[PDB]
Amino acid sequence: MQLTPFLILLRKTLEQLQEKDTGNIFSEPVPLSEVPDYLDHIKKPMDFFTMKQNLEAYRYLNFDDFEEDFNLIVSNCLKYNAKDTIFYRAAVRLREQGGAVLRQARRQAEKM
Ligand SMILES: Cn1c(=O)ccc2ccccc21
């Protein structure tokens, strides 16, 4: 299994997942200046920019490495925000619409 096709697949997958975040609320780290209590109960912040950096730093060498960080985006947002917020519901939607994107991408990786 070769690194380059896998990183190509991950790049395409990341773009596809990011397309689902239509408000771009997960594009960059949660602004810790704007939400000072964020780190009280969120242990590992994650966002799509950080994911792209990790990808390009060769930190993702299997599909789980990648999916785990995607799942952190979602779970951190569910954890931090009240259910009655757009932010919470955006994480739900990202989880749901991301599901098929990740499943298809993993099937591709398994054929490598
Ligand atoms: C995703 N998210 C949160 O989960 C919480 C606060 C916040 C503030 C600005 C941008 C995104 C944010």
UniProtKB/Swiss-Prot annotation:
High levels in testis. Residues 1-105 form the Bromo domain. It is found in: Nucleus; Chromosome; Cytoplasm. It is linked to Intellectual developmental disorder with dysmorphic facies and ptosis: An autosomal dominant neurodevelopmental disorder characterized by delayed psychomotor development, intellectual disability, delayed language, and facial dysmorphisms, most notably ptosis. Additional features may include poor growth, hypotonia, and seizures. Component of some HBO1 complex composed of KAT7/HBO1, MEAF6, ING5, and BRPF1. Component of the MOZ/MORF complex composed at least of ING5, KAT6A, KAT6B, MEAF6 and one of BRPF1, BRD1/BRPF2 and BRPF3. Interacts (via PHD-type zinc finger domains) with unmethylated histone H3 at 'Lys-4' (H3K4me0). Interacts with trimethylated 'Lys-36' of histone H3 (H3K36me3). Interacts with ING5; interaction directs BRPF1 to H4K4me3-enriched chromatin at the 5' of active genes. Interacts with KAT7. Scaffold subunit of various histone acetyltransferase (HAT) complexes, such as the MOZ/MORF and HBO1 complexes, which have a histone H3 acetyltransferase activity. Plays a key role in HBO1 complex by directing KAT7/HBO1 specificity towards histone H3 'Lys-14' acetylation (H3K14ac). Some HAT complexes preferentially mediate histone H3 'Lys-23' (H3K23ac) acetylation. Positively regulates the transcription of RUNX1 and RUNX2. This is Peregrin. It comes from Homo sapiens. The chain holds residues 628 to 739 of 1214 of the full protein.
